[PDB]
Copies of this chain bind each other. A is one copy, B any other.
């Protein structure tokens, strides 16, 4: 028995708010979950096409994973990273030998507890390996929230600052942490189109975004730039780059003697219909960061995978870094089971298939809806650009530079979400003009149809314009 009224009371009173003021806050109790559904205390079932934070890849409450965690609990317990366990050794083995067995770059893994911790770790390693301070990120990148990971996060609305309630006159950024000179922000891969939608390139055929990034590094001195960090599809920032961007980044970094870190926290583990996002582009990074789909959120886990050469350098020294819960044996038991089910049940192929299906459904919805400017993606990770049906331009001018000071009733993705909710579906986005769609890798055709139907409905209401 649960007194859910008392839960709501304690939630309001004793928990710090995020994204909502206390004044506007309404708690949203979830009593249990299963597959692609959340279940409220009263039995209301919600089809979650956010997959929480694109991070419950295997599906909610997988029985094999939960069984594996219970088995681990018969033995552990807790030991820290200095001690060896079967679960932690095996989890690293599955990643390097089984998932990445066909690639030569993978060297060694360090496990930590969250994606931000994985990014912090990758930044530290890249800087130690190169003995260089600067890291290049991109406009709209999101790489986590802790002090080091936030420095390479250039998504204005997600930098742990304060904004007002339906007022944009109240921006407060964290003092002493609102900019960092050890990071250079390169432009979005998406910023160099001409008025016809064609890509701008230099005389050598290099995308202008890449060429600009190259010039920034030359100007600061390649001898002081450790790495470029990317997302192959910007997650929170909600954008897909030109196909040639990632290959050209790989090339450019090799030529300049600079490491490439690809952040796979969100794109990893089948999200994009391949094992990793980078594998769509025929190149291999120096370092990747992992979270989310690593355990499909069953328990907190993050990881960094470094190349053979980076691993060999680190092996030669005593590294003075300790994180209490890094390698936690029960979280590692969850990771092993998560990955074993993903492999065994061919979840990556499932995602590719469901993605091809989703593309079809979006082709149909676009023909039917003028507020869809474009859509793109793969697997269970899609963007849909929303535009004013009349003007063919976005409703919110600041777009990906907006802040949460805005009134949600003026935000197209907030409007869409609220309408789709009437149909028992959670679907929308985090950017004002852009849908961010994702479900479990094994989402059913039936649930995809249900989601797309609710979206059809929300888009009718949006294009009616009676919300304005």
Contact = CB atoms under 8 A, between A and B. Distances in A.
20 contacts: A14-B95, A16-B108, A29-B84, A32-B77, A33-B77, A33-B79, A60-B77, A78-B296, A127-B175, A128-B175, A132-B175, A147-B148, A156-B220, A156-B221, A157-B320, A164-B317, A185-B219, A300-B325, A300-B331, A320-B403
A7 to B, nearest CB: 5
Contacts of A218: 156, 398, 401
A52 interface: yes
A411 interface: no
Contacts of A60: 76-78
A253 interface: no
Given A30-B83, A318-B163, A53 B324 contact: yes
Nearest to A26: B84
Given A114-B114, A114-B325, A145-B323, A82 B18 contact: yes
Given A123-B177, A131-B172, 20 more contacts: A7-B84, A8-B84, A10-B89, A16-B306, A33-B76, A33-B79, A69-B73, A78-B297, A78-B298, A117-B117, A120-B147, A134-B179, A147-B148, A156-B218, A162-B320, A163-B320, A170-B317, A177-B180, A178-B181, A320-B404
Given A14-B89, A14-B93, A108-B14, A318 B30 contact: no
A28 B84 CA distance: 5
Instruction: Determine how many copies of this chain the complex contains.
Output: 4
Interface in A223-274: 223-224, 226
Contacts of A463: none
A146 interface: yes
Nearest to A160: B321
A165 interface: yes
A281 interface: no
Contacts of A457: none
Interface residues of A, number: 163
Given A221-B156, A320-B404, A88 B11 contact: yes
A31 interface: yes
A19 B81 CA distance: 10
Nearest to A111: B15
A284 interface: no
Given A171-B221, A324-B53, A315 B21 contact: yes
A347 interface: no
A115 interface: yes
A18 B139 CA distance: 34
Interface stretch (A209-217, A359-367, A369-377, A445-453): A209-217
A184 interface: yes
Given A2-B86, A10-B89, A83-B28, A162 B297 contact: no
A120 B117 CA distance: 11
A97 to B, nearest CB: 8
A226 B130 CA distance: 22
A43 interface: no
Nearest to A226: B175
Contacts of A219: 139-140, 154, 156, 185, 401
A66 B15 CA distance: 25
